[PDB]
Structures are given as C-alpha cells and as structure tokens.
Write a protein that binds this ligand. Sequence first.
Ligand SMILES: N[C@@H](CC(=O)O)C(=O)O
Ligand SMILES: N[C@@H](CC(=O)O)C(=O)O
Ligand SMILES: N[C@@H](CC(=O)O)C(=O)O
Lengths: 397, 397, 397
Amino acid sequence: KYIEYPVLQKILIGLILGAIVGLILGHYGYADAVKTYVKPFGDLFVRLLKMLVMPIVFASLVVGAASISPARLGRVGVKIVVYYLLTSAFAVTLGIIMARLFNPGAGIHPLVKILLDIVPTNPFGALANGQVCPTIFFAIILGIAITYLMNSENEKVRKSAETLLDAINGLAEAMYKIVNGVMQYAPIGVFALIAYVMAEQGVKVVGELAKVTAAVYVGLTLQILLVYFVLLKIYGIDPISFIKKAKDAMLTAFVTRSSSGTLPVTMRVAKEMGISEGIYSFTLPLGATINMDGTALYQGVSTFFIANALGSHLTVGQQLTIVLTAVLASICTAGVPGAGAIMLAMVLESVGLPLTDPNVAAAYAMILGIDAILDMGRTMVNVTGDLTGTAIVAKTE
Amino acid sequence: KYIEYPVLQKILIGLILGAIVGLILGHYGYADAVKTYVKPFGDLFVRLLKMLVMPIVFASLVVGAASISPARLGRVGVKIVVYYLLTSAFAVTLGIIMARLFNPGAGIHPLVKILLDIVPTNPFGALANGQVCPTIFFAIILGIAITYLMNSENEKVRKSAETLLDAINGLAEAMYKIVNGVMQYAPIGVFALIAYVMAEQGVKVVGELAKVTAAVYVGLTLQILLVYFVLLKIYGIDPISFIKKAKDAMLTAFVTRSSSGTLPVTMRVAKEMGISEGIYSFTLPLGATINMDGTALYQGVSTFFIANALGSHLTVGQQLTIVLTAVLASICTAGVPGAGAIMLAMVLESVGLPLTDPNVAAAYAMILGIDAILDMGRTMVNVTGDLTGTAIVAKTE
Amino acid sequence: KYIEYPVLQKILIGLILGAIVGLILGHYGYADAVKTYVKPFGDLFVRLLKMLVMPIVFASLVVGAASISPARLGRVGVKIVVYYLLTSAFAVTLGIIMARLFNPGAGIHPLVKILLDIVPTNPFGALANGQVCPTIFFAIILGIAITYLMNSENEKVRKSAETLLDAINGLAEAMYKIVNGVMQYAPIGVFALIAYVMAEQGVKVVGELAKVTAAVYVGLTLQILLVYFVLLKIYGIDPISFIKKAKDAMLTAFVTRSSSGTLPVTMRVAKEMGISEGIYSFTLPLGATINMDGTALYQGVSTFFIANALGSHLTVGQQLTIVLTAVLASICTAGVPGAGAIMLAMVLESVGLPLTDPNVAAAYAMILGIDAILDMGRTMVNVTGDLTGTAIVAKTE
Ligand SMILES: N[C@@H](CC(=O)O)C(=O)O
Ligand SMILES: N[C@@H](CC(=O)O)C(=O)O
Ligand SMILES: N[C@@H](CC(=O)O)C(=O)O
C-alpha cells in the first residue's frame, strides 16, 4: 500500500491539514455539512481506542507483577506510588495557584466508601462491565500468587502455572500489535477530529475563554519545568538529555489524544535509553493509568472556573477538599479522549456544585468545547511524568 | 441406553408423532392441559440452543482466521462477503415481488449510527452481556494479530502465542461435542414444540393466514431454484449432485430449528464432498450467522403483511427502505428459534410502524403463531445458502 | 513480620478481645464511635470473601469433573446428591418441630420455572453478572466434554484439550493461595465484626429473642448428634474418631463465617484422614455450595418466627410449602456471611408474607441482628455435613 512514511510525520500532516480545512470552511455555510460527514469518521477512531484499553490494563499488569519477586516488588512499588501521589498533589495545588493569579471565567452572576470500593465484589463482573481500579487490584493479587506457585515443589501445579501465565502474556502481546494497527488509521481520524473542532470555534468569543486556556497552558508548562528539572537535578540526571529521548514520546502523545496507544512507543523509548527492563515493565503500565496529573491540574483549574462563574468563595477546607478529591478522581479516570470532563463532574459534585443547574451547565458547555484543545496538552504532560518517575527510581539503585 | 438409532430418523419420528397428538388432542378439552405439561419440556430445549451459540461464534472465528495467512484472507473474505450481501438483497426483493403478487393480509381497516455501533466500546462487556456483531469484529482482529505474532522472531512470545491459540481452539471443540449431546434431547423437544403448535392451530381460520403461508413458501422455493441453479450453472456445478450432499444438511436444518446445531453436520458434509478445509472452516461459521437470507425474505413479506393490515401504501423510497433495513436487521439477528420475529420488530419500527399500537399488534400476534411453522423453512434455506456460497468460491480457484 | 502464630489461635484471640471491648464500650457513649471507625475495617473483610467465591466455584468443578471418568461420575454423583437433598429435608423438618415445641416470637398482634432457570441462557453472562447454579451446570458439562476429547484419536485436538484444562486448573490453585492470604487478615476483621455486634446488643431485651436463639441452637446440636451418629453407626464409622479430625475444620468454620475459606482447610483434613482423592475433590466443592442445611433449618425456624409474629396459622400444605421452598432456596444461596437472610426473604415471599409490610419488617430487623450470632453455628454445621457425606460414600466402596 502507499502509506509508507513513518507514523509521527503522517499524524502531523493530518493535524495540520485538518486545522486549515476547519478554518476555511468555518467562514462559509459548509461549516454545517462537516458535522454530518466528518464526525462519523472521527468517532470511529475514538471507539477503537476504548476497545484496546481494557485488555492491556489487566494483562500487562499480571505479567509484570509475575516477573518480579515479591520483595523487590515491595521496594519499587512503595517508592513509585509515593512519588506518583506526591507529584499529583503538587500539580493540582500549582493549578490552584494559577487560577488564583489569573482569576478566570468571572462572567456574569462517602470519603471512606470510595476507598473501600477499590476491592472488587466480583472479579469477572467488575472486569467486564465495571471499573479500572478493581481490575488493577485483582491483577496484582493474581500475579503474586502465580509467583509463589512457580516456586512450589510439585511439578503438576508448576506446569499448570507456567501455562496459565503464558496464555495471559499472549493476550498482552496481541493487543500491542493491535495498537500499531490503530495508529495507521490515526492520521485520518485526527484530521477529522481537529477539523470539526476548528469549524465550531469562533475565535474572538473564544478569546475570553482563551484566558482560561492561557492559565491552563502556563500551569502545565510551569509544572514540567519546575518539578521535573528540580527532581532530576537533585537525583543527578542531565535534563536536556532526558528530554531528548522523551521528545519522541511527548510528540506522539501530543498529537494523539491517548495515554495508552503511547504506551508501546513509551516502552520502545525506555528500551532505547537503557533502563532495567522489569522495573519499567511493571512501573510504566501502572503509571499509564495512575499518572494523569496533567488532567488533575486541569480539573482543579476548571473547578475554580466553574466556581467563579457561579460566584462562590472557597474556604481553606473547601480548597483542601478540591485537592484530595482531585487526586482520587484522577486515579479513577480512564486513559482515553475526553474522559477528564466526565470525571470533572465527579469532583464538582463532591465540592457541592450540581451539574444539573442550567447556569453552571452553560458554563460547563463552554469549557467542554475547549476541552478538546486542552486534552492534547494533558496527554503530553502525562507521558512526561511516566518517563521521569521511572528514570528517577532506576537512578536510585 | 436404548436410544441407538441415527439422529435424523429419531427426530423425524418425534416430529410426526407430535403433530398427530397435537391434532387429536386439539378436538377435545385436553387441548388445554398440554400447555402446562408439554411446554416446559419444549422450552428446556430452546434454552439449551441459546447457551451453545455464543461460545461457538467467538471461538470458531478466532481459530479460523488464525489458520489462514492475511493475503489469502483478503481474497476469500471479499469474495464471500460480496456474495452474501448481494444474495440477501436478491432474496428480499424477490419476497417483495411475491407479496405484491399475492397481496396477503388485507383484512379490515441512525442509519450511520448502527454501522458505527459494530465496533465494540468494550470487548468483554459486549461479549458477555452484549451483541453478536461486535464479537465477530473483535474475534477477527485478534486472529490476525496472533498470526503476526506466530511469525515473530523471539521465541518467548512465539510460545506464548501458540499456547493462547490452543486454549481457544480447545473451547471450540468442546462446544461442538456439547452440540451432539443436545441433539440427543432434540427428538423429545421437537415432539413437544410441534405438539403445542398443532394444538393451538385452528385450521380453517388459519386458512386465511395460509395465503400468507403460501406466499412465503413459494418465495422460498423460488429462491432456491432460480438463484442457486443459475449461479451453479454459470460457474459449472451439477446442481442435483450438489443437492444430493446438501440434502442431509437441509433435512437436519428443516426438522431442527437451529442454524447453529446444524453447523457441525454441515462441516461433516463439507468434508465429505471434498473441499479445501481452511476455506470452509473460515467461511462457513461466518456464513452461519450472516447468511440468514431466508429470514430476510420472510421479514420483507411480513412487513408487507403488516402494512396491508394497517392499510398503508409504500413509495419507491419506502420499499428501498425496507430492503436496506432488512439486510442489516438480518445481519443483526441470532441463530436460534423464533428470533426472526424480534428482529422483524426492528425493521417495522424503522419503516415507521409502531409495535405498541393495538390493531397492528393483533395482526402481529396472528403472524407470531404461524412463525413457528415458517421457521423450519427459513432454516432449510439458510443452510442451503451456506453450502452453495462456499462451493462457488472454491470452484473459482 | 511478627504475626507468626498458627491461624486458628490468632482468630480465637481476636474474637475474644473483640467481644470484651464491645461489651465494655457498650456501657458508655463510645458505643457510638465504634460504628464509624470499626465497621469499615469489618466490611473490608466481607468483600474479600465474596471476591474469591466465584472463581473457586467454577474452576474447581471443571477440574474435578474432568479428572474422573463418566461412569464413576454417574455412581458417585447420584449417591451424593440423593444424600444431600434427603438430609436437607430432614434438617428443615427437625427445625419445624423445634419451632412448634418452643413456639418463639409470639409478640403482639413459578415452581417449575425456577427449576428450568438452572440452565443458563448465556454462559458468560450468567458467569460474570448472574448466579451460582448455572455456572455449576455449565462447568460440569464442560468437564465431561473435555474428558471425551482427551480420549480422542487426533493429536492436534488432544494437545489443545490438555492445555485448556491446565489453564483452568492454574486459576484454581491461585485462588486457593489467595484464600490463605485473606485468612491472615481474618483475625483483625473478626475482631471488628464481633465488636460491633456486641456493642449493639442490649442483653436483657435480647433475652426475649434469646428464646429464638435457644430454639435454633438446640435444633442444630440435635441435628449433628442424631442424624450424623445414626448414619455413621449404620455404615460403620467410629463417630468420636471422625469428629476428632472434623474438629479442626469445625472450629475454623465456627470462628470464621465463610463456608468457602474453610474449603482448603477441609481438603487438608480430607488428605489427613486418608480418603480417595478424586472422590473428595469432586464431592467436596459441590458440597460446599449445596450442603447449607444448617442455613435451611435456620430459615425454617425464622419463617415460623415471622409467621408467629404476624399471627398466622399454617396448614399441612403450607408447611410442606415451607419445606420444599427452603430446600431450593438453600441451594440458591451463596457461601458468604449474612446471605442466609437475603434468601430467607425468598422463602417468605414464597409462603406469601410480604417483606415490605412494616410490622413484619420490624420483626425481621430484630432477627437480622441476631443473625450475625446464628451465622457462626450455621457454618459449623455445614462443614460437618460436607465431611460426613464424603466419608459415608467412601465407606460404601
Ligand atoms: N484521556 C487522556 C487524558 C485525559 O484527558 O483525561 C489520556 O489519558 O490519554
Ligand atoms: N433462528 C433460525 C433463523 C430464524 O428463524 O431467524 C436459525 O438461525 O436457525
Ligand atoms: N454464609 C454462610 C452460610 C449462611 O449463613 O448462609 C456460609 O456459607 O459460610
């Protein structure tokens, strides 16, 4: 076939052309037709991303945890989890500071229960029709168990364990190649998605919301620079050299709006920059789904936007409430386009702002449009976080 | 045990005796009692057919697609799919012609969205509690992927892929033997089913609906003769010799009301008449669930019946609407007794006739009774279609 | 780590201390605080028990049935099933006799369809989000099939079958070690559970309900003694010697409120007392979920309690109705804490007493409290039943 260029170049070309077409059709009546024809081609991409998420989450964990002995798992797991949560908190507070400084959108005027829920009442049921988190719990559990079995004395169960582990590993590999296949469609789909967005955008009225956009972007960039360079220089990594390798991943994640299709590319990058394989094999897929701190910063800023549009004022307690809820709601989120808004609703209802009130609903719609733009940034920052965290831990050894 | 005859003979005997008993009890008060005692024995058969459908659909596809290299898959797949759809359209239009000629039942007076839906938003979720079509998509996908893995260079993933494929294949084989087991119950169950039908039937009032029945049967027989003999003689097969082998399958499918229990018998027939194994292994289970064109012709005729009972008149556009909708709704259907009526409702609501209106509901009930008779014919024609299509393609090589 | 004692000792210590703390805090205002802090630690145990139930039911059956040839399966299966049902009936009638004698709680004033339901309309769907019983049916089916395949002549399918069976067996083993892991948490959780119960209990008012409690306990103890000693002496087992081994299992089952975590300990006990392995491997996990006759006796007694609180009088027909319904509803039940009450509702609605009427609802709440106490007894008697039944059958050979 004739599509033979390398992937990222293809996607970039598609993005560019889609933006141009969206603008020039925006001026004229064709701005309507594009909805009917183009959007279907876009949605077909989105769905293909959701499909591949669920199998890669379960399987890849099970293999990863199985490969490592339990003690080493203890050490690496605690280090990494501590780092993940701390950085997420740092990110959302940085976002709140940005919101306070810019003050966007002024316009015109069970807390234990959720921590208990993480344990699956039923594994198959939660796996098929339920949530991400419980599958993570069950996967790690099963991996540890299979390890102990492989040490066992009796050959019968030893052979059984080996073959089970091999089956699950096979499922994982297959899903990765499926991802490559989807990326070939990705240029066409990206073209469609961005074209519809640009055609709906009216620039100068969007200019008011652009103050929101500026707050968000400045927050994201500040996070990258400040946090990751400070940490890398404390532990002793040359940041520009790290970013050199990261750049491929970050580009792929910026143009595509998946935190998950990026995963195999990320693992290639990890193999290139010479890291102990098992460590990244375990930590990276866990990170792909926990390290959505960019989405956390966004959620904080948007919570402040909606609050400012409603006109409320927040105590220290309510701002702490935002912070904690945002961490947990980010952990609950799933790695696919647009999802961050659906979880933003969770945190809003936590703080006490109803999604069904029409005034705030209108403001929310305004934000939902620009969410498509902000999504690209969020994804870039997420993959950055993954790579940095793994590199740090590996440097400690 | 004492049931030792060959299967088809057993089923035929059961059918005959059940019909006789239904008639002679129909004359007298016992016509009531049979509902309570006999129907339960019948339902227990129906359920056993549904159970075995879902696993054989998924598994058998995955193995089939895995066995064949991708290029050959391209060629055979496109040929077969084109043929399937074309013949389905031919069938439903033939049915509309029959309806126009006989004019039965006069009595007394998202289109893209569904094509998008075929992609599963979640594979496990759609597999367990969702539809047929998406499992087909995902199965084919997974098979292709496993093929590429088996070519891969690295032994670890090679062994993993092999073992996964073997597991799935094992599930398939087991389900086939389960089918044989169910067929042993089938004589008893067929006896029950047909007895209840005959006991409910009042012959002379059914005589008016018998004009509907005659239209349907004449349509089916005309389809067999005209379409399949024309095609076979174009490509160069002796039709009576083909039908000789087909006869076993067609009988088994006529007496039993499953398009799926017939599948193993069909594959035996394919092995007998000497066909390239991989080709039929892939094309036949796909055909078992797509080639329900007999049900398509029925759905067209019944749509015209309901329309004539409502008294409406149909433009060229609405008749085209019937045709297209019928193709897609047949593809959505599942291979078990009585299902065709449930999908008939889909096409009716598509054309714009509400199922909840009482007048048309009464007419629909009249048709639902005779649906049990017509089901047998539909199934015969379906298996005919499967065998013919595979034979044609194999003849082209 | 510092928790190094043997399990049962740990659990006993936890139970004791939790009871004491519950009482002494009960006197004072702290009786309130314990709800908030302690209950969460308790629930986290309960959920972990539910999780592990569903996988061990399916997998362990499939392996068991696969190991044994079909003929031997016929013999052992019929013997065991007959025994299970007969003893369940004996138990519930004994309970009704006890209820008549004590007359507790006087206070102040589809039957075929469910038997048909056992067959799964969809296997994956019933497995993930549906019930226990259909998974049992499908599991046994699949096991038999895999056996025949292993006899088959063709090596390809032979290898496939072997590998499938090995996968499923691996899942089983892993789940057993998970059970051990949960038991380490069990002491802490038991402490919490019992403490909350004791803190809610007001002793002297509970003294009236204690007449209910006495009826129940006397019934249970009478069942053990009379039934099992009569049977053991008929077939020729020294009862005290049997109970010697049983004692470990019965203690573990009394302190823990799971009929399922006890299963591996039970199988250890079976290996100790020298029984043919395959026989107990099949019969014991089937028994773990069918032999809940202690819960059956309780359900009968509680049905009479609620009836006496409503003030109704029961014919011979209605008492037979209770008996039959109780057998089936016990079979439907699942092996986890508190479940017996939820199925008690099924039998109540069967007899015709509505759960939504407030008077009987109040009485039901009174019983629901003490259900936590009675649960321990039920579980002890259940594991006794399992061991005795297997021992009897093995003695016949
Ligand atoms: N869906 C994005 C992040 C987000 O916007 O929530 C990803 O994980 O790839
Ligand atoms: N259920 C039939 C066809 C139909 O009547 O819809 C079959 O596929 O066997
Ligand atoms: N849930 C208990 C019995 C019951 O109380 O229903 C068990 O099976 O362990």
